Design an enzyme around this catalytic site. Structure first.
Site, PDB file in Angstrom:
ATOM      1  N   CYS A   1      -0.016   4.088   2.524  1.00 18.27           N
ATOM      2  CA  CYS A   1       0.479   3.696   3.881  1.00 18.27           C
ATOM      3  C   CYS A   1       1.923   4.101   4.126  1.00 18.27           C
ATOM      4  O   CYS A   1       2.259   4.579   5.228  1.00 18.27           O
ATOM      5  CB  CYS A   1       0.382   2.161   4.077  1.00 18.27           C
ATOM      6  SG  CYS A   1      -1.307   1.528   4.212  1.00 18.27           S
TER       7      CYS A   1
ATOM      8  N   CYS B   1       0.826  -1.192   0.000  1.00 15.20           N
ATOM      9  CA  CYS B   1       0.000   0.000   0.000  1.00 15.20           C
ATOM     10  C   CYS B   1       0.879   1.268   0.000  1.00 15.20           C
ATOM     11  O   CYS B   1       1.705   1.485   0.913  1.00 15.20           O
ATOM     12  CB  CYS B   1      -0.961  -0.016   1.227  1.00 15.20           C
ATOM     13  SG  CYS B   1      -1.875   1.550   1.317  1.00 15.20           S
TER      14      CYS B   1
END
Ligand SMILES: [Zn+2]
Ligand SMILES: [Zn+2]
Lengths: 105, 105
Positions: free
Chosen positions: A36, A33
């Site tokens: 993230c 991700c």
């Protein structure tokens, strides 16, 4: 500051018992991700601004914990007060995460 | 250990500005209200147990404040955290008031 990165299911429950007087804020993230990775150092900056316990959980390493809290979208942040989930932020919004911390701390 | 009883519209807004970094819990009550009298000493007990600002607002003295918070049932308790309303308890439930306090303090 306290910022704790967990290893396996069961680790969050121990943490919660061992930090009874304080708000716990958990960042559920994944290694694939990108947002993230962008929000990680900003979540570390928050941990230095607030008297709460900041926790990072890789959903591929703590799969039953991800299920316990019904986590889908990455990242998701949850606030846990007196051991119960009280709030969440879905997505990489550092303003929202900070607002949630102010509401529950 | 602050329990503050207000006098006129505008008072709550000055209170909030002056207590910006604490939970404020407001008891909107009336002189005609039986449950309000039953819970009053129990609200005072909570004020002596928790580090928050406890406030009493007579809805017939602060009429436009009562309107502004849409108060209907007596008493109604409102939690205010960073100036935003974050929770309420409708009716004289001291257990639910204490739960509200724990969640937001
Ligand atoms: Zn004061
Ligand atoms: Zn607090």
């Amino acid at each position: 500051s306290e910022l704790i990165e967990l290893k396996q299911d069961g680790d969050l429950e121990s943490l919660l018992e061992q930090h009874k007087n304080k708000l716990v804020v958990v960042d559920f993230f994944a290694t694939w991700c990108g947002p993230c990775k962008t929000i990680a150092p900003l979540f570390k900056e928050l941990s230095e601004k607030y008297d709460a316990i900041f926790v990072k959980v890789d959903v591929d390493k703590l799969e039953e914990t991800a299920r316990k809290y019904n986590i889908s979208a990455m990242p998701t942040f949850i606030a846990i007060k007196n051991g119960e989930k009280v709030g969440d932020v879905v997505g990489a919004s550092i303003a929202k995460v900070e607002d949630m911390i102010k509401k529950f701390i």
